[model samples]
Target: EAEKCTKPNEQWTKCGGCEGTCAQKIVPCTRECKPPRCECIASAGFVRDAQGNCIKFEDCPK
Candidate 1:
């Protein structure tokens, strides 16, 4: 099994929920047979920019 997430920015590896669209990251597994969990940064605003960074929804492209 993979020890950690080698690719984060790529598709399918990105975070869901919240508007940040932040990339998922690997964390230490406390239990046996459990895979690493992917974590993402929460969005500070209502939306995220095209670059996937957090930003105000009003700043989004019209």
Candidate 2:
């Protein structure tokens, strides 16, 4: 089991889901069972940063 997510504009998701990050807007997860993880709320205009935290697109690191 994984720990709860502790970040703003983020949420825990199933392993089968794909998370869009700052470095890569479009992502793909493996087609298999895996551990759950924290991902940005894409619909809310959030994306994962390099540190695995969710933030706004304009705040993405260069």
Candidate 3:
């Protein structure tokens, strides 16, 4: 017999540190009430700030 998935599609949420440059991870689920896993990531030469915004490397603080 075939079983169905109860969890919704993986989605992205605000970053723990930087609200920007955040990403979502998709995983296979077999149960309901599953939670989403979040991660912070920035593009090349970009950095994440405490405000969760992506900043330039030159604009970032030491």
Candidate 4:
């Protein structure tokens, strides 16, 4: 099993995926899958900021 993950929703996934970013309104998941890794899970109204931390998408910085 993978190591324990932390934060709001940064969890280890069996399949590699594309996560939303500060500037990226839509994340295009191109990977079919991959080894386990930590990734940000999409919330009701949240997105990963420039630092890869999940934050409110509407409240993103300029």
Model 1: per-residue Cα lDDT at residue 13 = 20
The model with the greatest TM-score is 2
Write one digit per residue (lDDT tens) for candidate 2, span 1-62: 34367765656656525556766665765565347666555655677776866688888756
Each model's lDDT: 0.37, 0.63, 0.36, 0.63
Q: What TM-score fits each model? A: 0.28, 0.48, 0.30, 0.47
In model 4, what are the clashing residue pairs, if there are any? none
lDDT of 1: 0.37
Instruction: Write candidate 1's Cα lDDT for 9-58 as tens digits.
Output: 21222444432422322223444332324433233333344665544445
lDDT tens digits, residues 1-62, model 3? Answer: 11122332212323233222223222223544324343322323444556755455466555
lDDT of 4 by residue, 1-62 (tens): 54467775566666656656656655776566556777655534558876757776776766
- lDDT measured at residue 6 in model 1 versus the true structure, 0 to 100: 42
Model 4, stretches more than 4 Å misplaced?
A: 1-4, 22-26, 43-46, 56-62
Residue ranges of candidate 2 with Cα displaced over 4 Å: 1-7, 11-16, 30-39
RMSD (Cα, Å) for all candidates, in order, is: 10.6, 5.0, 12.8, 4.3
Q: Sort the candidates on lDDT, descending order.
A: 2, 4, 1, 3
Model 2 per-residue lDDT at 62: 65
Question: Which residue pairs does candidate 1 place in steric collision?
Answer: none
Q: Can you tell me which runs of candidate 1 are displaced by over 4 Å?
A: 1-17, 20-45
The best-first sequence of candidates by TM-score reads: 2, 4, 3, 1
Cα deviation of 20, candidate 1, in Å: 6.3
Q: Candidate 2, after superposition: displacement of residue 39 in Å?
A: 5.0
